[PDB]
């Protein structure tokens, strides 16, 4: 895969729900490889031209994929999160993020997963889910 250029339309598009049970194993492998090759800690389908709701992460309290990730709970208010993005090399933005989130979805074997995250990992998750909605820093 390739990390799309900062002017790619896919970055602003909405990624489609993955049909339940669809074989995503190779896609996740490719996405993980793209993320690590670029020295990232997270990556979303849109960033590699895959308009499917798949994220991959290598964050302090979560490493792996989430298929159809959703935020089911979060803290009120916002906190400071300085973030870069593999799609925007050289740019750091001070984002407002929820300090804690719970993210739910499916793993590559279509087992339901739940991720309770705070701080950096919570920011990671919110940033990647944003990508799937065409939202960038």
- Residues marked active site are found at 128
Q: Is 34 in the site for Zn ion (CB under 5 A)?
A: no
**DSSP-assigned letters across all residues of 69-119:** EEEEEE-SS-EEEEE--TTSTT--EEEEE-SEEEEEEE-TT--EEEEEEEH
Residue among 54, 85, 103, 132 that touches Zn ion (CB under 5 A) = 85
Q: Is 1 in the site for Ni ion (CB under 5 A)?
A: yes
Please tell me the distance from the alpha carbon of residue 74 to that of residue 117, in angstroms, as a whole number: 9
74 marked among binding-site residues: no
Strand partners, 130: none
124 marked among binding-site residues: no
User: Residues interacting with Zn ion, by CB under 5 A?
Assistant: 85
- Binding-site members for Zn(2+) are 85, 127, 131
User: Residues interacting with Ni ion, by CB under 5 A?
Assistant: 1
């Amino acid at each position: 895969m390739k990390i799309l250029k900062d002017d790619a339309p896919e970055l602003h598009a909405i990624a489609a729900e993955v049909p339940h049970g669809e074989d995503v194993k190779d896609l996740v492998l490719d996405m993980t490889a793209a993320m690590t090759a670029a020295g990232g800690i997270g990556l979303a389908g849109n960033q590699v031209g895959v308009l499917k709701r798949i994220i991959v992460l290598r964050c302090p309290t979560f490493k792996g994929c989430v298929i159809n990730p959703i935020i089911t709970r979060h803290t009120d208010g916002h906190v400071y999160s300085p973030e870069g993005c593999l799609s925007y090399p050289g740019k750091t933005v001070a984002k407002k993020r929820r300090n804690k989130v719970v993210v739910e979805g499916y793993d590559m074997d279509w087992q339901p997963i739940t991720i309770a995250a705070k701080g950096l990992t919570a920011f990671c998750l919110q940033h990647e889910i944003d990508h799937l909605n065409g939202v960038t820093i």
